[PDB]
PDB file of all heavy atoms in Angstrom:
ATOM      1  N   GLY A 200     -71.200 -77.141 120.248  1.00  0.00           N
ATOM      2  CA  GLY A 200     -71.804 -77.965 121.264  1.00  0.00           C
ATOM      3  C   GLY A 200     -71.390 -79.415 121.232  1.00  0.00           C
ATOM      4  O   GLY A 200     -71.249 -80.050 122.289  1.00  0.00           O
ATOM      5  N   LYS A 201     -71.197 -79.994 120.039  1.00  0.00           N
ATOM      6  CA  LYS A 201     -70.799 -81.388 119.938  1.00  0.00           C
ATOM      7  C   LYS A 201     -69.519 -81.657 120.703  1.00  0.00           C
ATOM      8  O   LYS A 201     -69.414 -82.645 121.446  1.00  0.00           O
ATOM      9  CB  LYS A 201     -70.613 -81.803 118.471  1.00  0.00           C
ATOM     10  CG  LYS A 201     -70.205 -83.255 118.312  1.00  0.00           C
ATOM     11  CD  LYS A 201     -69.859 -83.600 116.890  1.00  0.00           C
ATOM     12  CE  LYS A 201     -69.272 -85.026 116.792  1.00  0.00           C
ATOM     13  NZ  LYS A 201     -68.785 -85.354 115.436  1.00  0.00           N
ATOM     14  N   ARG A 202     -68.524 -80.796 120.517  1.00  0.00           N
ATOM     15  CA  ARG A 202     -67.245 -80.959 121.206  1.00  0.00           C
ATOM     16  C   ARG A 202     -67.371 -80.626 122.685  1.00  0.00           C
ATOM     17  O   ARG A 202     -66.793 -81.314 123.510  1.00  0.00           O
ATOM     18  CB  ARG A 202     -66.162 -80.086 120.554  1.00  0.00           C
ATOM     19  CG  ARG A 202     -65.597 -80.682 119.262  1.00  0.00           C
ATOM     20  CD  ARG A 202     -64.137 -80.227 119.033  1.00  0.00           C
ATOM     21  NE  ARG A 202     -64.061 -78.899 118.446  1.00  0.00           N
ATOM     22  CZ  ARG A 202     -63.031 -78.062 118.648  1.00  0.00           C
ATOM     23  NH1 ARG A 202     -62.020 -78.431 119.398  1.00  0.00           N
ATOM     24  NH2 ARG A 202     -63.060 -76.870 118.071  1.00  0.00           N
ATOM     25  N   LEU A 203     -68.149 -79.610 122.989  1.00  0.00           N
ATOM     26  CA  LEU A 203     -68.344 -79.230 124.393  1.00  0.00           C
ATOM     27  C   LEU A 203     -68.858 -80.430 125.186  1.00  0.00           C
ATOM     28  O   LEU A 203     -68.364 -80.719 126.290  1.00  0.00           O
ATOM     29  CB  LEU A 203     -69.307 -78.069 124.538  1.00  0.00           C
ATOM     30  CG  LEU A 203     -69.337 -77.463 125.942  1.00  0.00           C
ATOM     31  CD1 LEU A 203     -68.069 -76.674 126.181  1.00  0.00           C
ATOM     32  CD2 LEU A 203     -70.556 -76.544 126.118  1.00  0.00           C
ATOM     33  N   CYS A 204     -69.844 -81.117 124.643  1.00  0.00           N
ATOM     34  CA  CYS A 204     -70.443 -82.263 125.331  1.00  0.00           C
ATOM     35  C   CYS A 204     -69.523 -83.460 125.427  1.00  0.00           C
ATOM     36  O   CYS A 204     -69.792 -84.429 126.135  1.00  0.00           O
ATOM     37  CB  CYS A 204     -71.746 -82.669 124.673  1.00  0.00           C
ATOM     38  SG  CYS A 204     -73.021 -81.392 124.712  1.00  0.00           S
ATOM     39  N   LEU A 205     -68.413 -83.408 124.713  1.00  0.00           N
ATOM     40  CA  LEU A 205     -67.445 -84.499 124.744  1.00  0.00           C
ATOM     41  C   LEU A 205     -66.322 -84.255 125.760  1.00  0.00           C
ATOM     42  O   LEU A 205     -65.574 -85.159 126.094  1.00  0.00           O
ATOM     43  CB  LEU A 205     -66.863 -84.758 123.348  1.00  0.00           C
ATOM     44  CG  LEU A 205     -67.882 -85.433 122.426  1.00  0.00           C
ATOM     45  CD1 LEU A 205     -67.343 -85.537 120.987  1.00  0.00           C
ATOM     46  CD2 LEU A 205     -68.214 -86.818 122.993  1.00  0.00           C
ATOM     47  N   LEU A 206     -66.239 -83.013 126.255  1.00  0.00           N
ATOM     48  CA  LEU A 206     -65.222 -82.715 127.256  1.00  0.00           C
ATOM     49  C   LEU A 206     -65.479 -83.511 128.526  1.00  0.00           C
ATOM     50  O   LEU A 206     -66.616 -83.750 128.891  1.00  0.00           O
ATOM     51  CB  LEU A 206     -65.232 -81.204 127.625  1.00  0.00           C
ATOM     52  CG  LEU A 206     -64.864 -80.233 126.503  1.00  0.00           C
ATOM     53  CD1 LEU A 206     -64.925 -78.821 127.058  1.00  0.00           C
ATOM     54  CD2 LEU A 206     -63.481 -80.570 125.960  1.00  0.00           C
ATOM     55  N   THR A 207     -64.402 -83.919 129.172  1.00  0.00           N
ATOM     56  CA  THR A 207     -64.482 -84.667 130.414  1.00  0.00           C
ATOM     57  C   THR A 207     -64.479 -83.654 131.560  1.00  0.00           C
ATOM     58  O   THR A 207     -64.162 -82.467 131.346  1.00  0.00           O
ATOM     59  CB  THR A 207     -63.253 -85.559 130.600  1.00  0.00           C
ATOM     60  OG1 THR A 207     -62.058 -84.745 130.620  1.00  0.00           O
ATOM     61  CG2 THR A 207     -63.116 -86.549 129.455  1.00  0.00           C
ATOM     62  N   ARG A 208     -64.825 -84.103 132.771  1.00  0.00           N
ATOM     63  CA  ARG A 208     -64.810 -83.210 133.936  1.00  0.00           C
ATOM     64  C   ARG A 208     -63.397 -82.633 133.996  1.00  0.00           C
ATOM     65  O   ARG A 208     -63.204 -81.442 134.201  1.00  0.00           O
ATOM     66  CB  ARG A 208     -65.105 -83.992 135.207  1.00  0.00           C
ATOM     67  CG  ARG A 208     -65.130 -83.182 136.485  1.00  0.00           C
ATOM     68  CD  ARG A 208     -64.108 -83.662 137.537  1.00  0.00           C
ATOM     69  NE  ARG A 208     -62.941 -82.806 137.615  1.00  0.00           N
ATOM     70  CZ  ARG A 208     -61.677 -83.222 137.620  1.00  0.00           C
ATOM     71  NH1 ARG A 208     -61.419 -84.505 137.559  1.00  0.00           N
ATOM     72  NH2 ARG A 208     -60.698 -82.355 137.709  1.00  0.00           N
ATOM     73  N   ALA A 209     -62.404 -83.506 133.794  1.00  0.00           N
ATOM     74  CA  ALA A 209     -60.983 -83.110 133.807  1.00  0.00           C
ATOM     75  C   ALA A 209     -60.687 -82.022 132.794  1.00  0.00           C
ATOM     76  O   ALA A 209     -59.962 -81.080 133.080  1.00  0.00           O
ATOM     77  CB  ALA A 209     -60.098 -84.331 133.557  1.00  0.00           C
ATOM     78  N   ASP A 210     -61.237 -82.143 131.585  1.00  0.00           N
ATOM     79  CA  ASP A 210     -61.027 -81.166 130.538  1.00  0.00           C
ATOM     80  C   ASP A 210     -61.552 -79.780 130.941  1.00  0.00           C
ATOM     81  O   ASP A 210     -60.889 -78.766 130.748  1.00  0.00           O
ATOM     82  CB  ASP A 210     -61.678 -81.592 129.225  1.00  0.00           C
ATOM     83  CG  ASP A 210     -61.042 -82.835 128.630  1.00  0.00           C
ATOM     84  OD1 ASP A 210     -59.799 -82.881 128.579  1.00  0.00           O
ATOM     85  OD2 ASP A 210     -61.784 -83.761 128.213  1.00  0.00           O
ATOM     86  N   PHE A 211     -62.775 -79.770 131.487  1.00  0.00           N
ATOM     87  CA  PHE A 211     -63.302 -78.484 131.952  1.00  0.00           C
ATOM     88  C   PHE A 211     -62.379 -77.923 133.007  1.00  0.00           C
ATOM     89  O   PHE A 211     -62.103 -76.716 133.046  1.00  0.00           O
ATOM     90  CB  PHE A 211     -64.715 -78.666 132.538  1.00  0.00           C
ATOM     91  CG  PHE A 211     -65.824 -78.563 131.535  1.00  0.00           C
ATOM     92  CD1 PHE A 211     -66.435 -79.698 131.020  1.00  0.00           C
ATOM     93  CD2 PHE A 211     -66.272 -77.294 131.107  1.00  0.00           C
ATOM     94  CE1 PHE A 211     -67.464 -79.598 130.099  1.00  0.00           C
ATOM     95  CE2 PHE A 211     -67.305 -77.162 130.172  1.00  0.00           C
ATOM     96  CZ  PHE A 211     -67.888 -78.336 129.658  1.00  0.00           C
ATOM     97  N   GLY A 212     -61.886 -78.824 133.861  1.00  0.00           N
ATOM     98  CA  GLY A 212     -60.983 -78.416 134.934  1.00  0.00           C
ATOM     99  C   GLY A 212     -59.743 -77.656 134.444  1.00  0.00           C
ATOM    100  O   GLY A 212     -59.323 -76.691 135.091  1.00  0.00           O
ATOM    101  N   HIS A 213     -59.143 -78.095 133.348  1.00  0.00           N
ATOM    102  CA  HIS A 213     -57.962 -77.406 132.853  1.00  0.00           C
ATOM    103  C   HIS A 213     -58.299 -76.042 132.257  1.00  0.00           C
ATOM    104  O   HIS A 213     -57.520 -75.101 132.340  1.00  0.00           O
ATOM    105  CB  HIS A 213     -57.254 -78.238 131.780  1.00  0.00           C
ATOM    106  CG  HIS A 213     -56.672 -79.505 132.314  1.00  0.00           C
ATOM    107  ND1 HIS A 213     -57.439 -80.557 132.785  1.00  0.00           N
ATOM    108  CD2 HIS A 213     -55.388 -79.917 132.442  1.00  0.00           C
ATOM    109  CE1 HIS A 213     -56.646 -81.527 133.204  1.00  0.00           C
ATOM    110  NE2 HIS A 213     -55.397 -81.174 133.013  1.00  0.00           N
ATOM    111  N   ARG A 214     -59.492 -75.937 131.664  1.00  0.00           N
ATOM    112  CA  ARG A 214     -59.889 -74.668 131.046  1.00  0.00           C
ATOM    113  C   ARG A 214     -60.497 -73.688 132.031  1.00  0.00           C
ATOM    114  O   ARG A 214     -60.686 -72.523 131.704  1.00  0.00           O
ATOM    115  CB  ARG A 214     -60.828 -74.931 129.893  1.00  0.00           C
ATOM    116  CG  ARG A 214     -60.204 -75.741 128.768  1.00  0.00           C
ATOM    117  CD  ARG A 214     -61.262 -76.366 127.869  1.00  0.00           C
ATOM    118  NE  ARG A 214     -60.686 -77.383 126.954  1.00  0.00           N
ATOM    119  CZ  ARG A 214     -60.065 -77.098 125.832  1.00  0.00           C
ATOM    120  NH1 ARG A 214     -59.908 -75.843 125.425  1.00  0.00           N
ATOM    121  NH2 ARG A 214     -59.552 -78.091 125.072  1.00  0.00           N
ATOM    122  N   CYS A 215     -60.803 -74.168 133.234  1.00  0.00           N
ATOM    123  CA  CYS A 215     -61.409 -73.322 134.279  1.00  0.00           C
ATOM    124  C   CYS A 215     -61.122 -74.018 135.626  1.00  0.00           C
ATOM    125  O   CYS A 215     -61.954 -74.746 136.158  1.00  0.00           O
ATOM    126  CB  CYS A 215     -62.930 -73.187 134.068  1.00  0.00           C
ATOM    127  SG  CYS A 215     -63.784 -72.059 135.219  1.00  0.00           S
ATOM    128  N   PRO A 216     -59.921 -73.800 136.165  1.00  0.00           N
ATOM    129  CA  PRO A 216     -59.492 -74.403 137.435  1.00  0.00           C
ATOM    130  C   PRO A 216     -60.410 -74.034 138.591  1.00  0.00           C
ATOM    131  O   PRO A 216     -60.614 -74.833 139.520  1.00  0.00           O
ATOM    132  CB  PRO A 216     -58.096 -73.841 137.637  1.00  0.00           C
ATOM    133  CG  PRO A 216     -57.601 -73.623 136.225  1.00  0.00           C
ATOM    134  CD  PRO A 216     -58.829 -73.013 135.565  1.00  0.00           C
ATOM    135  N   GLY A 217     -60.952 -72.820 138.529  1.00  0.00           N
ATOM    136  CA  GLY A 217     -61.841 -72.368 139.583  1.00  0.00           C
ATOM    137  C   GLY A 217     -63.207 -73.026 139.650  1.00  0.00           C
ATOM    138  O   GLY A 217     -63.666 -73.415 140.725  1.00  0.00           O
ATOM    139  N   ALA A 218     -63.870 -73.170 138.499  1.00  0.00           N
ATOM    140  CA  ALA A 218     -65.190 -73.743 138.518  1.00  0.00           C
ATOM    141  C   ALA A 218     -65.560 -74.684 137.379  1.00  0.00           C
ATOM    142  O   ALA A 218     -66.710 -74.740 136.947  1.00  0.00           O
ATOM    143  CB  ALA A 218     -66.213 -72.622 138.566  1.00  0.00           C
ATOM    144  N   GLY A 219     -64.580 -75.418 136.898  1.00  0.00           N
ATOM    145  CA  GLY A 219     -64.833 -76.352 135.811  1.00  0.00           C
ATOM    146  C   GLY A 219     -65.933 -77.368 136.130  1.00  0.00           C
ATOM    147  O   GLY A 219     -66.776 -77.656 135.261  1.00  0.00           O
ATOM    148  N   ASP A 220     -65.936 -77.931 137.350  1.00  0.00           N
ATOM    149  CA  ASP A 220     -66.953 -78.919 137.722  1.00  0.00           C
ATOM    150  C   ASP A 220     -68.372 -78.399 137.568  1.00  0.00           C
ATOM    151  O   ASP A 220     -69.261 -79.153 137.157  1.00  0.00           O
ATOM    152  CB  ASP A 220     -66.721 -79.359 139.176  1.00  0.00           C
ATOM    153  CG  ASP A 220     -65.561 -80.338 139.314  1.00  0.00           C
ATOM    154  OD1 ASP A 220     -64.476 -80.092 138.761  1.00  0.00           O
ATOM    155  OD2 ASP A 220     -65.748 -81.357 140.028  1.00  0.00           O
ATOM    156  N   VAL A 221     -68.578 -77.146 137.922  1.00  0.00           N
ATOM    157  CA  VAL A 221     -69.927 -76.528 137.794  1.00  0.00           C
ATOM    158  C   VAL A 221     -70.365 -76.540 136.344  1.00  0.00           C
ATOM    159  O   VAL A 221     -71.476 -76.989 136.009  1.00  0.00           O
ATOM    160  CB  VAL A 221     -69.904 -75.078 138.308  1.00  0.00           C
ATOM    161  CG1 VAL A 221     -71.248 -74.429 138.082  1.00  0.00           C
ATOM    162  CG2 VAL A 221     -69.505 -75.055 139.792  1.00  0.00           C
ATOM    163  N   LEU A 222     -69.494 -76.043 135.480  1.00  0.00           N
ATOM    164  CA  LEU A 222     -69.790 -76.001 134.055  1.00  0.00           C
ATOM    165  C   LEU A 222     -70.155 -77.369 133.569  1.00  0.00           C
ATOM    166  O   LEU A 222     -71.219 -77.598 132.995  1.00  0.00           O
ATOM    167  CB  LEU A 222     -68.545 -75.487 133.283  1.00  0.00           C
ATOM    168  CG  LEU A 222     -68.068 -74.076 133.702  1.00  0.00           C
ATOM    169  CD1 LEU A 222     -66.881 -73.667 132.875  1.00  0.00           C
ATOM    170  CD2 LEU A 222     -69.209 -73.105 133.451  1.00  0.00           C
ATOM    171  N   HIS A 223     -69.270 -78.339 133.842  1.00  0.00           N
ATOM    172  CA  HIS A 223     -69.485 -79.685 133.411  1.00  0.00           C
ATOM    173  C   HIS A 223     -70.797 -80.281 133.946  1.00  0.00           C
ATOM    174  O   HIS A 223     -71.529 -80.912 133.210  1.00  0.00           O
ATOM    175  CB  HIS A 223     -68.296 -80.546 133.836  1.00  0.00           C
ATOM    176  CG  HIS A 223     -68.424 -81.990 133.495  1.00  0.00           C
ATOM    177  ND1 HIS A 223     -68.963 -82.916 134.363  1.00  0.00           N
ATOM    178  CD2 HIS A 223     -68.102 -82.674 132.358  1.00  0.00           C
ATOM    179  CE1 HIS A 223     -68.985 -84.105 133.763  1.00  0.00           C
ATOM    180  NE2 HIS A 223     -68.454 -83.983 132.565  1.00  0.00           N
ATOM    181  N   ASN A 224     -71.065 -80.060 135.222  1.00  0.00           N
ATOM    182  CA  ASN A 224     -72.276 -80.581 135.844  1.00  0.00           C
ATOM    183  C   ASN A 224     -73.526 -79.995 135.204  1.00  0.00           C
ATOM    184  O   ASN A 224     -74.436 -80.712 134.806  1.00  0.00           O
ATOM    185  CB  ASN A 224     -72.271 -80.293 137.345  1.00  0.00           C
ATOM    186  CG  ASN A 224     -73.414 -80.959 138.067  1.00  0.00           C
ATOM    187  OD1 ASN A 224     -73.466 -82.198 138.170  1.00  0.00           O
ATOM    188  ND2 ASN A 224     -74.348 -80.183 138.575  1.00  0.00           N
ATOM    189  N   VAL A 225     -73.564 -78.657 135.073  1.00  0.00           N
ATOM    190  CA  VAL A 225     -74.716 -78.026 134.469  1.00  0.00           C
ATOM    191  C   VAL A 225     -74.940 -78.514 133.042  1.00  0.00           C
ATOM    192  O   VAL A 225     -76.064 -78.784 132.626  1.00  0.00           O
ATOM    193  CB  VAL A 225     -74.582 -76.473 134.456  1.00  0.00           C
ATOM    194  CG1 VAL A 225     -75.752 -75.827 133.748  1.00  0.00           C
ATOM    195  CG2 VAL A 225     -74.470 -75.977 135.890  1.00  0.00           C
ATOM    196  N   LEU A 226     -73.855 -78.644 132.278  1.00  0.00           N
ATOM    197  CA  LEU A 226     -73.979 -79.109 130.893  1.00  0.00           C
ATOM    198  C   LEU A 226     -74.577 -80.522 130.868  1.00  0.00           C
ATOM    199  O   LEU A 226     -75.476 -80.815 130.074  1.00  0.00           O
ATOM    200  CB  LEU A 226     -72.630 -79.122 130.189  1.00  0.00           C
ATOM    201  CG  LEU A 226     -72.650 -79.600 128.730  1.00  0.00           C
ATOM    202  CD1 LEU A 226     -73.707 -78.832 127.958  1.00  0.00           C
ATOM    203  CD2 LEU A 226     -71.307 -79.406 128.101  1.00  0.00           C
ATOM    204  N   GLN A 227     -74.105 -81.405 131.766  1.00  0.00           N
ATOM    205  CA  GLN A 227     -74.623 -82.763 131.788  1.00  0.00           C
ATOM    206  C   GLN A 227     -76.109 -82.777 132.097  1.00  0.00           C
ATOM    207  O   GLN A 227     -76.847 -83.584 131.524  1.00  0.00           O
ATOM    208  CB  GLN A 227     -73.887 -83.630 132.806  1.00  0.00           C
ATOM    209  CG  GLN A 227     -74.465 -85.045 132.874  1.00  0.00           C
ATOM    210  CD  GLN A 227     -73.521 -86.040 133.498  1.00  0.00           C
ATOM    211  OE1 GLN A 227     -73.605 -86.323 134.684  1.00  0.00           O
ATOM    212  NE2 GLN A 227     -72.638 -86.590 132.665  1.00  0.00           N
ATOM    213  N   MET A 228     -76.541 -81.926 133.020  1.00  0.00           N
ATOM    214  CA  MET A 228     -77.952 -81.885 133.357  1.00  0.00           C
ATOM    215  C   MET A 228     -78.787 -81.478 132.140  1.00  0.00           C
ATOM    216  O   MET A 228     -79.895 -81.978 131.946  1.00  0.00           O
ATOM    217  CB  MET A 228     -78.185 -80.950 134.550  1.00  0.00           C
ATOM    218  CG  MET A 228     -77.399 -81.427 135.746  1.00  0.00           C
ATOM    219  SD  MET A 228     -77.962 -80.760 137.314  1.00  0.00           S
ATOM    220  CE  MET A 228     -77.135 -79.189 137.321  1.00  0.00           C
ATOM    221  N   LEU A 229     -78.241 -80.582 131.311  1.00  0.00           N
ATOM    222  CA  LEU A 229     -78.969 -80.165 130.119  1.00  0.00           C
ATOM    223  C   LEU A 229     -79.028 -81.317 129.135  1.00  0.00           C
ATOM    224  O   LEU A 229     -80.052 -81.531 128.458  1.00  0.00           O
ATOM    225  CB  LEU A 229     -78.283 -78.967 129.451  1.00  0.00           C
ATOM    226  CG  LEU A 229     -78.396 -77.642 130.177  1.00  0.00           C
ATOM    227  CD1 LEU A 229     -77.812 -76.537 129.313  1.00  0.00           C
ATOM    228  CD2 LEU A 229     -79.864 -77.356 130.478  1.00  0.00           C
ATOM    229  N   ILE A 230     -77.944 -82.072 129.026  1.00  0.00           N
ATOM    230  CA  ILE A 230     -77.902 -83.221 128.120  1.00  0.00           C
ATOM    231  C   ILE A 230     -78.921 -84.240 128.561  1.00  0.00           C
ATOM    232  O   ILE A 230     -79.686 -84.739 127.750  1.00  0.00           O
ATOM    233  CB  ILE A 230     -76.477 -83.865 128.122  1.00  0.00           C
ATOM    234  CG1 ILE A 230     -75.474 -82.923 127.442  1.00  0.00           C
ATOM    235  CG2 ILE A 230     -76.496 -85.225 127.413  1.00  0.00           C
ATOM    236  CD1 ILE A 230     -74.044 -83.317 127.616  1.00  0.00           C
ATOM    237  N   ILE A 231     -78.952 -84.519 129.868  1.00  0.00           N
ATOM    238  CA  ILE A 231     -79.927 -85.452 130.433  1.00  0.00           C
ATOM    239  C   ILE A 231     -81.331 -84.919 130.186  1.00  0.00           C
ATOM    240  O   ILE A 231     -82.202 -85.646 129.703  1.00  0.00           O
ATOM    241  CB  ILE A 231     -79.714 -85.622 131.937  1.00  0.00           C
ATOM    242  CG1 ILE A 231     -78.418 -86.402 132.186  1.00  0.00           C
ATOM    243  CG2 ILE A 231     -80.910 -86.339 132.561  1.00  0.00           C
ATOM    244  CD1 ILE A 231     -78.024 -86.467 133.646  1.00  0.00           C
ATOM    245  N   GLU A 232     -81.523 -83.663 130.532  1.00  0.00           N
ATOM    246  CA  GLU A 232     -82.803 -82.977 130.368  1.00  0.00           C
ATOM    247  C   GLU A 232     -83.324 -82.992 128.923  1.00  0.00           C
ATOM    248  O   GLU A 232     -84.507 -82.857 128.681  1.00  0.00           O
ATOM    249  CB  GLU A 232     -82.702 -81.542 130.856  1.00  0.00           C
ATOM    250  CG  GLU A 232     -84.025 -80.789 130.961  1.00  0.00           C
ATOM    251  CD  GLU A 232     -83.842 -79.359 131.389  1.00  0.00           C
ATOM    252  OE1 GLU A 232     -83.181 -79.131 132.420  1.00  0.00           O
ATOM    253  OE2 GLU A 232     -84.360 -78.435 130.707  1.00  0.00           O
ATOM    254  N   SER A 233     -82.401 -83.134 127.959  1.00  0.00           N
ATOM    255  CA  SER A 233     -82.795 -83.145 126.565  1.00  0.00           C
ATOM    256  C   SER A 233     -83.066 -84.576 126.060  1.00  0.00           C
ATOM    257  O   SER A 233     -83.907 -84.772 125.190  1.00  0.00           O
ATOM    258  CB  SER A 233     -81.729 -82.491 125.681  1.00  0.00           C
ATOM    259  OG  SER A 233     -80.595 -83.338 125.548  1.00  0.00           O
TER     260      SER A 233
END
C-alpha cells in the first residue's frame, strides 16, 4: 500500500492504459477518506 499510494496518475496509466485514472481516483478517495 505504501508504494501504491505513491504512484502518480501517470504511473497508474502505464500499468493500466484502459482505466488507470479510475484506479488512481478511487485510491485517492480512500486516502482522503482515511
Side-chain angles (χ1 to χ4, degrees):
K201 180 187 173 186
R202 281 208 279 152
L203 191 72
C204 298
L205 287 174
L206 296 181
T207 60
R208 181 238 105 227
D210 294 314
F211 271 100
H213 294 67
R214 297 161 192 279
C215 185
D220 283 47
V221 176
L222 299 181
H223 178 269
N224 188 67
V225 177
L226 181 52
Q227 178 161 95
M228 300 199 277
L229 288 187
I230 290 170
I231 290 172
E232 188 182 309
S233 73

